[PDB]
Amino acid sequence: PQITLWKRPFVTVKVGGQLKEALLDTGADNTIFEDINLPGRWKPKMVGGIGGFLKVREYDQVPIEIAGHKVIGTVLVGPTPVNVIGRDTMTQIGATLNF
Amino acid sequence: PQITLWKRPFVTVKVGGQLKEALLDTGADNTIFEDINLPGRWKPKMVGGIGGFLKVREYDQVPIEIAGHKVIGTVLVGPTPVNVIGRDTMTQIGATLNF
Lengths: 99, 99
Ligand SMILES: COc1ccc(S(=O)(=O)N(CC(C)C)C[C@@H](O)[C@H](Cc2ccccc2)NC(=O)O[C@H]2CO[C@H]3OC[C@H](OC)[C@H]32)cc1
Ligand SMILES: [Cl-]
Ligand SMILES: [Cl-]
Ligand SMILES: [Cl-]
Ligand SMILES: [Cl-]
Ligand SMILES: [Y+2]
Ligand SMILES: [Y+2]
Known about the structure:
The structure is a homodimer of 99-residue chains. Chain A is built from 1 helix and 9 strands. Chain A is mainly beta. The longest helix of chain A has 4 residues, at 87-90.
């Protein structure tokens, strides 16, 4: 799709079998969800944005269905106020900015 | 321009006469800079990042030169770790996402 930015750029995503909405976020290096449970081992990580830092779990090689593509990427899980799709996932679907 | 997202999408801007770089950030509703000085009245505001909230000053009707366009918009000023260009500014230059 092509979208303008008059509204928040939410997309519907299936991540580890779980349906979620997430913000296409060109200012986010990684992808982040709250309230999903993913199997297997993970590693601890922290991330920073405005406001401060969020504590997360990092899962590698997780399935993400997004914009008709199936991608396998890293997902961070922690109590973000909104779910975000970062550049790590958007590069895999060839997303571009036009301005 | 059209850009991919393999690197962080920085752009050079002039905001209230000061040159800065800022991240084109589709996940940000508003535009925020650190360490700029703007004249005149302002209103207090907070913004919630992933971390909670950053305290800012809100300036209305501020010049921003971005991507060969000159726009007038609202700018928030406060100690963000990275300057961002949000959707309030990007809609004024007709930016779009393709994915
Ligand atoms: C109402 O208006 C705004 C309200 C909030 C923001 S924001 O900066 O908090 N933000 C809101 C998002 C989270 C819904 C914009 C994001 O694009 C933000 C923009 C950003 C970029 C860098 C530093 C701080 C913030 N990036 C981060 O949350 O990125 C996180 C996740 O990926 C990592 O890469 C960059 C960060 O690593 C530091 C990590 C901006 C305008
Ligand atoms: Cl890992
Ligand atoms: Cl990694
Ligand atoms: Cl980069
Ligand atoms: Cl300071
Ligand atoms: Y990793
Ligand atoms: Y400073």
